[PDB]
């Protein structure tokens, strides 16, 4: 038997960047996937979020519209990349909220890639971690996305956040500073719900690129976008200026300023909201809040259209921020909403 810990992530800045080559600055969270398992003759796996057991015969990576696609999609990348492995037996637990926009999608994936890694000694290096999760998630499930997530969940290291470029796949550890807390507040509002949102933005960015005879946003000027149609144009021009916002964090973090970093958070949190029109009410109310209540800056994480914010607070802050936003919240809007605090981790292992 073994036992592998998979983190979920936030992304600190860089939100809808990966997709066309952008640069991106992830972090791998201390809320976990947990899976503990062994070698068996079919794939047997009891969820205990779903309180359920779902199985299928390595024969078998027929998708069925259900949880176990995850796992199948895993099973059918290595199979696609020429890996023999068999089958597991085991239990996925832990205590990452599922559909949170915290990716439980990428957590779970990787757990189980890293789970037949040591099982069956596949010797995998991390990049082709990443690259195998991405693969299968696009491919065998279905989900367009970018590399962000997949990358945070292997990649993550204790105390540090990641710069990426996605273009190259070049990267850089930045210390988190001490006593910083990311408050993650979760609106209850399932962004799976405009999934259809993600894939317009994606390929009108595509679209884009094609137009301006360019690989990647980080070749792109906010001069050149005249060139594009309105819809286009207002959209792209999120993500330059999303671009140079990144490397502005960068240059911040490493000087420790934690109040420019929080500044540039907030502002793109409202580029977001007002011209990328990937936010919502109740993620706007939580930014709000949380700069009345003291928080250096604000943001929604991931793709919008509900999931989950964060915001960075002083460490000795980070609880009742979060309590008095709730309860204000819970007033307001009829979700589930919930707040977790969180720190800079690992990435997958055991
Ligand atoms: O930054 C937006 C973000 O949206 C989702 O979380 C995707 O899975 C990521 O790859 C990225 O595109």
Redesign the pocket.
């Known amino acids: 038997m073994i036992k592998v810990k998979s983190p979920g992530r936030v992304?600190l800045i860089?939100?809808?960047?990966?997709?066309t080559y952008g640069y991106?600055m992830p972090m791998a969270i201390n809320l976990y996937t947990k899976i503990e398992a062994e070698k068996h003759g079919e794939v047997i796996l009891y969820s205990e979020h779903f309180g359920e057991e779902r199985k299928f015969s390595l024969n078998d990576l027929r998708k069925e519209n259900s949880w176990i696609d995850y796992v199948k999609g895993i099973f059918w990348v290595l199979k696609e990349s020429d890996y023999e492995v068999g089958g597991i037996k085991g239990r996925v637990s832990g205590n990452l909220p599922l559909g949170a926009?915290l990716?439980s999608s990428?957590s779970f994936e990787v757990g189980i890639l890293e789970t037949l890694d040591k099982l069956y000694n596949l010797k995998l290096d991390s990049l082709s971690k990443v690259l195998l999760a991405k693969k299968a998630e696009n491919e065998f499930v279905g989900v367009p996305?970018?590399?962000?997530?997949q990358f945070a969940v292997v990649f993550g290291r204790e105390g540090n956040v990641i710069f990426l470029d996605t273009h190259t796949l070049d990267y850089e550890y930045i210390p988190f500073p001490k006593d910083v807390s990311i408050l993650v507040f979760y609106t209850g509002v399932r962004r799976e719900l405009a999934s259809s949102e993600?894939a317009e933005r994606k390929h009108i960015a595509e679209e884009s690129l094609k137009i301006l005879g360019k690989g990647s946003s980080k070749e792109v000027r906010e001069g050149e976008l005249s060139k594009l149609p309105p819809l286009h144009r207002k959209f792209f021009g999120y993500i330059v200026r999303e671009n140079a916002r990144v490397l502005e964090v960068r240059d911040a973090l490493k000087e420790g300023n934690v109040e420019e970093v929080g500044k540039i958070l907030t502002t793109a949190h409202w580029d977001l909201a007002k011209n990328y029109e990937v936010s919502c009410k109740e993620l706007d109310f939580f930014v709000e809040r949380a700069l009345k209540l003291g928080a250096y800056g604000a943001r929604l994480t991931?793709?919008g259209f509900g999931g989950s914010a964060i915001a960075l607070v002083d460490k000795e802050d980070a609880e009742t921020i979060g309590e008095e936003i709730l309860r204000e919240y819970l007033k307001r809007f009829p979700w589930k909403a919930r707040h977790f605090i969180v720190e800079p981790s690992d990435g997958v292992g055991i």
């Open positions: 992304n860089g939100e809808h960047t990966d997709y991106v926009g990716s990428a996305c970018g590399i962000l997530d993600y991931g793709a």
